[PDB]
From a paper:
In previous work, we have introduced pAF into lactococcal multidrug resistance regulator (LmrR), a small homodimeric protein harbouring a pore that exhibits promiscuous substrate binding capabilities, either by direct incorporation using the dedicated orthogonal translation system (OTS),19 or, preferably, by introduction of p-azidophenylalanine (pAzF), followed by a post-translational Staudinger reduction. Position V15 resides inside the pore of LmrR, and is the same position of ncAA incorporation as used in earlier works featuring pAF as catalytic residue.
We used this improved OTS to incorporate aY via amber SCS at position V15 in the LmrR protein.
Residue numbers in the entry:
A (entry chain A), B (entry chain A): 3 to 115
Write the structure that this text describes.
């Protein structure tokens, strides 16, 4: 199977990349994820809010109330500076990792000679 | 920073890719990781054994005693069938994820028109 922790990591990554594209609210995020996935990934609100409560508590995203021109309150989320930085540190750390793995295949092969 | 959970995920991935290259023991694994990383990643044995105890408990790797031609016992580790499969499920799930993220950038851009 795919371990829960890995799923969670995936969902995190995706959701942060939606915010990267712009401040958004629950139903916008879900729709965007559904379209970009062909409906193969349909987030719940429960899930999205459980994740965001965690990201917000750790200061990676922040929330704010939208215009009430609509006449009803809507909560928006954005990536924070720390947010942006972690996404950057993460991305780079992973590309080093992918290099290390190239090098393992390389070194293996090279000693087949 | 890079969250501990992400570091752990990285170290897992790397270690499993070493076993992928062949059955190995602690000091072989460490050396191989150190060479493929330029010494930028020097695993402890403590760490390696804490991780492997977990992987082995979850049936992703298995261990066995090496030849005692050496005259001393050495423990080897190998990836299991389940091991190989999880590495495959994982890898594929991540490439879907990377696609989803392409599609988010794509969809964003496309509606700038």
């Amino acid at each position: 199977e795919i371990p829960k922790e890995m799923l969670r990591a995936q969902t995190n990554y995706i959701l942060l990349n939606v915010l990267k594209q712009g401040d958004n609210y629950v139903y916008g995020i879900i729709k965007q994820v559904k379209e970009a996935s062909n409906g193969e990934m349909e987030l719940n609100e429960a899930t999205l809010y459980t994740i965001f409560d965690r990201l917000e508590q750790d200061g990676i995203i922040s929330s704010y109330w939208g215009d009430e021109s609509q006449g009803g309150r809507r909560k928006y989320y954005r990536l924070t500076e720390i947010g942006h930085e972690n996404m950057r540190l993460a991305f780079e750390s992973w590309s080093r990792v992918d290099k290390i793995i190239e090098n393992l295949e390389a070194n293996k092969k090279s000693e087949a000679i």
